[PDB]
Each structure stands twice: as C-alpha cells, then as structure tokens.
Coordinates of C-alpha atoms and ligand atoms in Angstrom, one line a residue:
Chain A
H6 CA 32.6 -11.9 33.0
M7 CA 32.4 -11.6 36.8
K8 CA 29.5 -13.1 38.7
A9 CA 27.2 -11.1 41.0
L10 CA 27.6 -11.8 44.7
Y11 CA 24.2 -10.2 45.4
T12 CA 21.4 -8.8 43.3
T13 CA 18.3 -6.9 44.3
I14 CA 15.4 -5.6 42.2
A15 CA 13.2 -2.6 42.8
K16 CA 10.0 -1.5 40.9
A17 CA 8.7 2.1 41.1
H18 CA 5.3 3.4 39.8
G19 CA 3.0 6.3 40.3
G20 CA 5.5 9.1 39.7
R21 CA 7.1 11.4 42.3
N22 CA 4.1 10.8 44.6
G23 CA 4.2 7.1 43.9
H24 CA 5.7 4.0 45.4
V25 CA 8.7 1.8 45.2
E26 CA 9.4 -1.8 46.5
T27 CA 12.1 -4.4 46.4
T28 CA 11.1 -7.7 45.0
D29 CA 11.8 -9.4 48.2
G30 CA 9.5 -7.0 50.1
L31 CA 12.3 -5.9 52.6
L32 CA 11.9 -2.3 51.3
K33 CA 8.4 -0.8 50.7
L34 CA 8.3 3.0 50.4
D35 CA 5.9 5.7 49.6
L36 CA 7.4 8.7 47.8
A37 CA 6.6 12.4 47.6
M38 CA 8.2 15.4 46.1
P39 CA 9.7 17.6 48.8
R40 CA 8.1 20.9 49.9
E41 CA 11.3 22.7 48.8
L42 CA 10.4 21.8 45.1
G43 CA 6.7 22.7 45.5
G44 CA 5.6 19.1 46.5
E45 CA 3.6 18.0 49.5
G46 CA 6.5 16.2 51.3
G47 CA 5.3 13.7 53.9
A48 CA 7.2 10.8 52.4
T49 CA 10.8 10.1 51.3
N50 CA 12.5 10.7 47.9
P51 CA 15.5 9.6 45.8
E52 CA 17.8 12.1 47.4
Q53 CA 17.0 10.8 50.8
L54 CA 17.5 7.2 49.7
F55 CA 20.9 8.1 48.2
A56 CA 22.0 9.9 51.3
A57 CA 20.8 7.1 53.5
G58 CA 22.5 4.4 51.5
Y59 CA 25.7 6.4 51.1
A60 CA 26.0 7.1 54.9
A61 CA 25.5 3.4 55.7
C62 CA 27.9 2.2 52.9
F63 CA 30.7 4.6 54.0
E64 CA 30.3 3.6 57.7
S65 CA 30.7 0.0 56.7
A66 CA 33.8 0.9 54.7
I67 CA 35.3 2.7 57.7
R68 CA 34.6 -0.4 59.9
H69 CA 36.1 -2.6 57.2
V70 CA 39.4 -0.8 56.8
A71 CA 39.8 -0.5 60.5
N72 CA 39.4 -4.3 60.9
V73 CA 41.8 -5.0 58.1
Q74 CA 44.4 -2.5 59.4
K75 CA 43.9 -3.6 63.0
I76 CA 43.0 -0.1 64.0
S77 CA 41.5 0.5 67.4
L78 CA 38.0 1.8 66.5
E79 CA 35.6 2.0 69.4
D80 CA 32.6 3.5 67.5
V81 CA 31.7 5.4 64.3
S82 CA 28.6 7.2 63.0
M83 CA 28.2 8.7 59.6
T84 CA 26.4 11.8 58.3
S85 CA 25.7 12.3 54.6
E86 CA 24.3 15.5 53.2
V87 CA 23.0 15.3 49.6
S88 CA 21.9 18.2 47.6
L89 CA 20.2 18.4 44.3
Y90 CA 21.4 21.0 41.7
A91 CA 20.2 22.1 38.2
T92 CA 22.7 21.6 35.3
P93 CA 23.3 24.0 32.4
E94 CA 22.2 21.1 30.1
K95 CA 18.7 21.1 31.6
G96 CA 19.4 18.0 33.7
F97 CA 20.0 17.5 37.4
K98 CA 23.1 16.6 39.5
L99 CA 23.9 15.6 43.1
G100 CA 26.5 16.9 45.5
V101 CA 27.6 15.3 48.7
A102 CA 29.3 16.2 52.0
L103 CA 30.2 13.4 54.3
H104 CA 31.0 13.8 58.0
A105 CA 32.5 10.9 60.0
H106 CA 32.3 10.8 63.8
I107 CA 34.9 8.3 65.0
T108 CA 35.7 7.3 68.7
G109 CA 39.0 5.8 69.7
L110 CA 41.5 7.5 67.4
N111 CA 43.3 10.8 67.4
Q112 CA 42.2 13.4 64.8
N113 CA 45.0 12.6 62.4
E114 CA 44.5 8.8 62.6
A115 CA 40.9 9.2 61.9
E116 CA 41.5 11.5 58.9
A117 CA 43.7 8.8 57.4
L118 CA 41.2 6.1 58.1
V119 CA 38.3 8.0 56.5
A120 CA 40.6 8.6 53.4
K121 CA 41.1 4.9 53.0
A122 CA 37.5 4.1 53.5
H123 CA 36.6 6.6 50.7
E124 CA 38.6 4.4 48.3
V125 CA 36.8 1.2 49.2
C126 CA 33.1 2.3 49.5
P127 CA 31.2 1.2 46.4
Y128 CA 29.1 4.4 46.4
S129 CA 32.3 6.4 46.4
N130 CA 33.7 4.4 43.5
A131 CA 30.5 4.7 41.6
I132 CA 30.5 8.5 41.6
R133 CA 34.3 9.2 41.4
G134 CA 35.2 11.9 38.8
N135 CA 31.4 12.9 38.5
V136 CA 30.3 14.1 41.9
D137 CA 32.2 16.4 44.2
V138 CA 32.3 14.8 47.7
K139 CA 33.5 16.8 50.6
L140 CA 34.8 14.8 53.6
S141 CA 35.1 15.8 57.2
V142 CA 35.9 13.8 60.4
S143 CA 35.4 14.5 64.1
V144 CA 36.8 12.4 67.0
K145 CA 35.4 12.1 70.5
Chain B
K2 CA 22.4 27.2 44.9
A3 CA 20.9 23.8 45.9
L4 CA 17.3 23.1 44.9
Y5 CA 17.0 20.7 47.8
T6 CA 19.2 19.3 50.6
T7 CA 18.8 16.4 52.9
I8 CA 20.9 14.7 55.7
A9 CA 21.0 11.1 56.7
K10 CA 22.8 9.7 59.8
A11 CA 23.8 6.0 60.0
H12 CA 25.1 4.0 63.0
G13 CA 25.6 0.5 64.2
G14 CA 27.3 -1.2 61.3
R15 CA 25.8 -3.2 58.4
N16 CA 23.2 -4.4 60.9
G17 CA 22.6 -1.0 62.2
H18 CA 20.1 1.9 61.5
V19 CA 19.9 5.0 59.3
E20 CA 17.5 8.0 59.5
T21 CA 17.0 11.3 57.8
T22 CA 17.1 14.3 60.1
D23 CA 13.5 15.2 59.2
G24 CA 12.4 11.7 60.2
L25 CA 10.7 10.8 56.8
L26 CA 13.1 7.9 56.3
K27 CA 13.9 5.6 59.3
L28 CA 15.3 2.1 58.5
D29 CA 16.9 -0.8 60.1
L30 CA 19.8 -2.4 58.1
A31 CA 21.1 -5.9 57.7
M32 CA 23.9 -7.6 55.8
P33 CA 22.2 -9.9 53.2
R34 CA 22.5 -13.7 53.5
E35 CA 24.4 -13.8 50.1
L36 CA 27.2 -11.8 51.9
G37 CA 27.1 -13.9 55.1
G38 CA 24.6 -11.9 57.1
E39 CA 21.2 -12.6 58.3
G40 CA 19.0 -10.5 56.1
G41 CA 15.6 -9.4 57.4
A42 CA 16.2 -5.7 56.7
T43 CA 17.2 -3.5 53.9
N44 CA 20.8 -2.5 52.8
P45 CA 22.6 0.1 50.7
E46 CA 22.2 -1.8 47.5
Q47 CA 18.4 -1.9 47.9
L48 CA 18.3 1.8 48.8
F49 CA 20.2 2.6 45.7
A50 CA 18.0 0.3 43.6
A51 CA 14.9 1.9 44.8
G52 CA 16.1 5.4 44.5
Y53 CA 17.4 4.8 41.0
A54 CA 14.1 3.3 39.8
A55 CA 12.1 6.2 41.2
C56 CA 14.6 8.8 40.0
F57 CA 14.7 7.4 36.4
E58 CA 10.9 7.1 36.3
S59 CA 10.6 10.8 37.3
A60 CA 13.1 11.7 34.5
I61 CA 11.0 9.9 31.9
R62 CA 7.9 11.8 32.9
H63 CA 9.9 15.1 33.1
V64 CA 11.2 14.8 29.6
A65 CA 7.8 13.8 28.3
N66 CA 6.2 16.8 29.9
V67 CA 8.8 19.2 28.4
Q68 CA 8.6 17.6 25.0
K69 CA 4.8 17.5 25.0
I70 CA 4.7 13.7 24.7
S71 CA 1.5 12.1 26.1
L72 CA 2.3 9.1 28.2
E73 CA -0.4 6.8 29.4
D74 CA 1.8 5.2 32.0
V75 CA 5.3 4.5 33.1
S76 CA 6.8 2.0 35.6
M77 CA 10.5 1.4 36.2
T78 CA 12.5 -1.6 37.3
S79 CA 16.1 -1.4 38.4
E80 CA 18.3 -4.4 39.2
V81 CA 21.4 -3.7 41.2
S82 CA 24.2 -6.2 41.7
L83 CA 27.5 -6.3 43.6
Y84 CA 30.7 -7.6 42.0
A85 CA 34.0 -8.4 43.7
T86 CA 37.0 -6.5 42.4
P87 CA 40.7 -7.4 42.8
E88 CA 41.5 -3.8 43.5
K89 CA 38.7 -1.5 44.8
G90 CA 36.7 -4.1 46.8
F91 CA 33.1 -4.4 45.6
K92 CA 31.6 -2.7 42.6
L93 CA 28.0 -1.8 41.6
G94 CA 26.4 -2.8 38.3
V95 CA 22.9 -1.8 37.1
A96 CA 20.2 -2.9 34.7
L97 CA 17.2 -0.6 34.2
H98 CA 14.0 -1.7 32.4
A99 CA 11.4 0.9 31.6
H100 CA 7.8 -0.1 30.8
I101 CA 5.9 2.6 28.9
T102 CA 2.3 2.7 27.8
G103 CA 1.2 4.8 24.8
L104 CA 4.3 5.1 22.6
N105 CA 5.8 2.8 19.9
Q106 CA 9.2 1.3 20.4
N107 CA 11.2 3.9 18.5
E108 CA 9.4 6.8 20.4
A109 CA 10.0 5.1 23.7
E110 CA 13.7 4.4 23.0
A111 CA 14.3 8.1 22.2
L112 CA 12.4 9.2 25.4
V113 CA 14.3 6.8 27.6
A114 CA 17.7 7.8 26.1
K115 CA 16.9 11.4 27.0
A116 CA 15.8 10.6 30.5
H117 CA 19.1 8.8 31.0
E118 CA 20.8 12.1 30.4
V119 CA 18.6 14.0 32.8
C120 CA 18.4 11.6 35.8
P121 CA 20.7 12.7 38.6
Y122 CA 21.5 9.1 39.6
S123 CA 22.6 8.4 36.0
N124 CA 24.8 11.4 35.8
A125 CA 26.3 10.6 39.3
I126 CA 27.5 7.1 38.2
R127 CA 28.2 7.9 34.5
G128 CA 31.2 5.9 33.1
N129 CA 32.0 4.1 36.4
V130 CA 29.0 1.8 36.6
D131 CA 27.9 -0.3 33.7
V132 CA 24.1 0.6 33.2
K133 CA 22.2 -1.6 30.8
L134 CA 19.0 0.1 29.7
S135 CA 16.0 -1.6 28.0
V136 CA 12.5 -0.4 27.2
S137 CA 9.3 -2.3 26.7
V138 CA 6.1 -0.8 25.3
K139 CA 2.5 -1.8 25.9
Ligands
LIG4 CL1 15.0 -8.0 45.8
LIG5 CL1 16.6 15.6 56.2

C-alpha cells in the first residue's frame, strides 16, 4: 500500500552478448559473457552491475549513518567483490565480500559504523538470509 | 569454487563514481531528482534494474537450451522501485516482464517460472523483495 519514491525501468535484449538500457537513457550498456566462463569479455555483465550498485549503495549507507550519528567521517571508499557459484539445484547464486576504507575514525569506531550501515543499505536488506556477505573495514 | 569473481570500487558519495578493477564498467553516479538530487547520471537502483533484466533474460535462454525448447526471441523488462520503511530505511520492490516469441502462453509461463528459480539475482533477493513476474508472448 506504500507509494514508490522512485522507479526506474530497464530493458535487455540480445542475450549474454546483448544490450541493456534504462528507459530514461541514463544507463546504456553492452554486455558480454566473461572470459572465465568461455565468453569473449570486452563488456560488462550482471555480476559487475551488482558489485557496482552494491559498493555505491553501501558507501551511501555509511555516509548516511555517520551524518545521523554526528560521526566525524572524513572520507570513505567502498570495495565489493561478487562471485558467481553453481548450486546443487542446477541454478546459480552470488556471494559477496565488502571492504570499507574509512578515514577519520579509529578501527573500532569504524567497525561499529559499518555494522550499522549494513542494516540500512537496501541491497543488504534485499539479500539478508540468502547471500553470505563478509564485511571488513580498514582505517587510514 | 567460484565460477567468476569481479571487484568494484565506489567513491565520492551518491554523486560519486564506481568502477570495476578490470575497467569494463566505469560510471559516474548521481542522486535522482525524485530523491532530492540532480540526476544526470545513473544510480544503484538503475544498476540493479539493468543487471536483473539481463540476468533473467539469460536464465530464460539457459533453461530453454537445457530443456530443448526452441525460442525465436526473448526480451526482458525490469522495473525497480524504492519504498520508504519505518524501520530499515528504504526497500526495493521489483516487477519483471518477459516478452517471448515462439511459445504459447502456458509454455512461456512454465519456462519463466523455471528461469526465476535459476537466476542468481532472483535467488539473492528471494523472500525479502516482492517480485511480480508477468509474461507476454508474440
Ligand atoms: Cl528509467
Ligand atoms: Cl573486475
């Protein structure tokens, strides 16, 4: 019964070596199956798109929690590593490792901030209980 | 062991930048105007929408290849929305619309239901994200 704050539409065609675009034209992407799976590579793929979206979403959640908590964040960057695995049921699944690099906090402060961000990020909430996510954080 | 692994690094906030380490994906970001930003660049909801549409289309073709089902064509639309929650902040919801050429409606529904089981995006969000699935045939 809740109203969408934002909606975006994407259309894909042409298979794993095809093409995908958002209706508003802001994202227009060629696709290719990676060399590691016997493809030609040379373009992006859904695992990269998920890794990129997750890194950016989680960085935003760190910044949001720090702003709400009045935490003295100087900078943050976010690394996501996304792996594809085969399932016993002949499907596929993702696994994820996240690594935050946070400036301005001591190591313990940063670990608590990242933990809170993990509860707020919409990607993290979308995959809870389904995807194993490993978190690490470094300060500098 | 992993079939495939990739790494992305994001920096600069909602109006920042994200890249994969192999350089195949390099993107400026922006907060959409609907959320108070300026738009003019993509965002994590569009990335998810695009990856889900491509991933689900690949799952349809994969199941069809395994089941020896001749497909004349497939295209995939995904629609991704953000909703405000009282508790956990914002939440994703998804509508998927497959367009399949060469199968009648019952055959296409069966194929799309199986694809939904195989697609890694679907299995990632299963039960946390409402996913409405529809199929049209031509
Ligand atoms: Cl759009
Ligand atoms: Cl990479």
